[PDB]
Assembly symmetry: D2
Homo-oligomer: 283 residues x 4
């Protein structure tokens, strides 16, 4: 499987979106799992999940790696509402366009917020819910905010440079030996390719700050079986939010990886794939 | 598999133990996994692990459900050192007697302390380490101590009664509908059968209080791959100790079950069995 | 100062209350500080605050120790809304009847919930806010709920006995040597005197469970300078809620007493009095 | 009081130190309080405590603002042992030279580690103990380490620049409006004045990493009445260490300031001065 061989586009039409182009990477043909990426500059479906797509497909799932609005190859957009909710509407739009009745969702960070909003807004359209360090869940009981990683994300959006990208990735990942030339060059290309997405993201963030994303008060509504993962060493979203979700969602479990930053599905891909595939099969 | 069909005895000889009788339940014939029980009145190997032995054996392991010294059908003993260490010596004694070179250890509560001590004292004799709410790891950052469950455990040791047993089990388990007549009658029988074990436990606890069990300072020595589990709703050992282990052991992960008390391997047996078998196979 | 010499009654009329009798103990004549008690069986203003009234009066404050509706010498009531809000309406009713424009509030547990609700509903009527382990602020990130102390409070309400009272006080206080015959006899008398309050409390709790009390989502509205205290060893309301308040209220500080249960103003009266008087004077 | 008018030097002789020059600022003449500064580049007694010296002197204390070895105007040194212990020996050396029998200690960060080590090593020479975010107390249960602030401290030591200083101060303080030209210029001067201290600090840190500073296991030995303060928003030492100290020291209390970074005695000087003076007077 490659980015090119799996690449597809679909126009969506859903509450606010009109003939809006969504890019996604699709492989496999079984039960649908939609994987939703984080909000960093240059983020996208393939780049965030390419270590996961193969094993999930091998396990018999149809995997859709979705580019959220205003990221990668999806259409440019300025959002005046919190991104989790707007992104969730776009997932629903994609599912309607592709005739998908129910999907399992996997979401990291912004994608975790998207998945939570989707579960809240469209409970009859979700199977299981997999959350990796979801963002926007209000204050931490321990971590000063904005967190270290978030400050760097905003620096890189506002003043993109190769050096600042490197600094961000050093904070993003626990094991520094994972920061290869390939990773750096690839992430730098995606930032250079879409400067309009960078500008639009910053405008959107002024209109709807991270405080507007907090859906904590509604977590008791979630009826989906939920698997929460966290990196022990995540400098972007606070570990105690893993506990917040575990206490507030009816049927959840929490798995914390040691020696792991903000990209658990990539930093601990083998363990992540095994645990999440087992969850989808047996929970 | 039944208690009777799996029941075996072996005399051990190891640092302090001389021709000391250990009872254990054995099934299967592959790689050895020794499962170590908690310290409540009437506790033992079979009673604590009978929902786990079958699936582990099916997975190809040889399972040994060990009765710790001063419990169930093992010999009576008064201990003047912390139980985790004394119990670990007894595991080594059993392995030497049975010609077992290396074992995976699974330990709940007192059994978790036993397993940690074993990993520290005999690192060349352990494979992987599975810890379910290990006891004795010092103060909690949040929970007043002694914890609610521990107060009840001491009440039941000192004044055993059917009513006090019921009260303890209500705190021990999250889902009250798991407290069947069978569970109550069985636990009551094991308490009635061995009053000397109750008396000896209390004498031992005066000689070596829970504060003597704390091996926190040595956790950096543990080289075993470690899987830590906790019940979210454990009223016997504090949830934050799961974090303590995760930060201090080199190669660990933490899994927390929602709606789960102090007997995770029984209350969430299916998920526990799947996760731990996968860990032993693939980690 | 004695209970008898300070005892006063006033009829209140405020949203739901019609000619409703409120008992209070008053001393001093300066700036008004209203102290609000917890929700345990037999609780009241004088009993909960008699170690505080003198020093506050000496410092130049007018101290009002209010009996909440359905407690001690105030009128009996069955509440169908969360007690914090209903109690707050009663404080407003008292202040209107006594021609008090603004008051500083001190509230422990239920009284802390009352004080938070008062600050939210009537921001122009509050000076400073002092909270000692306020109750009803949703789940803990660490403590299983209901907490140990709360289970005992409900046991004592439903089946009042001298032995159960003693058990509750043992959990309520850290230092067991504070449980004198005087304390026990006094608390037992207040329970015996008002069996109707016990029955009504339990009916009220069925109509509006503790989950209905949670005002967390509104804490950002509080503009009062706030001093939060917690007992390190509080088995009734969880320590992490001290952090919740500290992160969510604009201008707060948190003080945690070691070796202290659920009655900090009594268990650490000297330090409590000094800190709170300094706060009222200088903050 | 000014830096110049209070400036004194004394040669010390104590376990490893031979005719070693210590600079300190002294004012007042009552009971001695020694204030101990943090470990950032350019740190010193006067600079760290000039908002505290006046009120403590007014309260009747003799205040000694000590420059630790290898800082400000004290002699240059390369340390091969953990700085807390070496610094404590230097405090003892100063007290012996000045004929001071007992001192109250106030210590922030490195100075908090110094004060803890002093209490452990010389219990008969300490009065009360005041700790503001002490450093080196092992891992956090929540914060990835090294913490954000610590990474910046090491960057500034290794590559001192005006821009990096500004970045560090932005993380060091919660309220950005406290970063005046005066603060920046002053801190920059102290860095420019003593480049040898910067180089020596880095050599020392290689010889004895922060892990060597951890005295957690010995906290039960501390018999001094202890007052622990923390900034809620401290990005240099983790908030949960405030809890660690509170649970492990016999007689402690914890006060947490909201809207406060790593320099609580300066950022919340009025409240800090009032609380600590009251503690010294009445505890
Ligand atoms: O995971 C990524 O792709 C990435 O580069 C990120 F930095 C993701 C971070 C978030 O999406 C994020 C959103 C919201 C929040 F509160 C915290 C973090
Ligand atoms: O799991 C059991 O069998 C049981 O009945 C227990 F209550 C086990 C508890 C412990 O072994 C225990 C030991 C030490 C400790 F600190 C806390 C709990
Ligand atoms: O402080 C008392 O008077 C007392 O006897 C109590 F047990 C008070 C407890 C509460 O008011 C309480 C209310 C709500 C809650 F969530 C937890 C505790
Ligand atoms: O407070 C200061 O003067 C300062 O500039 C600091 F950054 C102090 C920090 C420490 O001394 C420090 C030491 C050890 C540690 F683990 C964490 C922080
Ligand atoms: Na490499
Ligand atoms: Na049943
Ligand atoms: Na006494
Ligand atoms: Na200014």
């Amino acid at each position: 499987l490659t980015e090119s061989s799996t690449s597809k586009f679909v126009k969506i039409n859903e509450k606010g979106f009109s003939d809006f182009n969504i890019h996604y990477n699709e492989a496999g043909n079984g039960e649908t799992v939609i994987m939703l990426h984080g909000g960093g500059p240059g983020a996208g479906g393939w780049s965030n999940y390419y270590r996961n797509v193969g094993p999930f497909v091998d396990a018999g799932y149809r995997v859709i790696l979705k580019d959220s609005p205003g990221f990668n190859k999806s259409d440019a957009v300025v959002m005046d509402e919190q991104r989790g909710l707007v992104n969730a509407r776009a997932v629903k739009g994609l599912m309607d366009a592709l005739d998908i009745d129910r999907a399992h969702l996997v979401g990291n960070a912004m994608g975790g917020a998207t998945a939570l909003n989707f579960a809240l807004e469209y409970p009859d359209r979700i199977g299981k819910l997999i959350l990796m360090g979801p963002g926007g869940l209000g204050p931490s009981m321990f971590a000063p905010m904005p967190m270290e990683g978030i400050k760097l994300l905003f620096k890189l959006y506002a003043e993109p440079s190769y050096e600042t990208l490197k600094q961000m990735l050093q904070v993003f990942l626990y094991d520094q030996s994972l920061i290869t030339e390939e990773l750096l060059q690839g992430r730098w290309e995606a930032i250079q390719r879409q400067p309009e997405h960078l500008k639009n993201f910053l405008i959107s963030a002024q209109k709807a700050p991270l405080s507007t994303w907090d859906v904590t008060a509604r977590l008791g509504e979630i009826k989906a079986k939920t698997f929460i993962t966290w990196g022990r060493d995540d400098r972007f979203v606070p570990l105690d939010h893993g506990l917040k979700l575990l206490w507030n969602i009816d049927d959840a479990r929490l798995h914390v990886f040691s020696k792991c930053g903000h990209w658990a599905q990539w930093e601990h891909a083998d363990e992540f794939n095994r645990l999440v595939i087992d969850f989808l099969r047996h929970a």
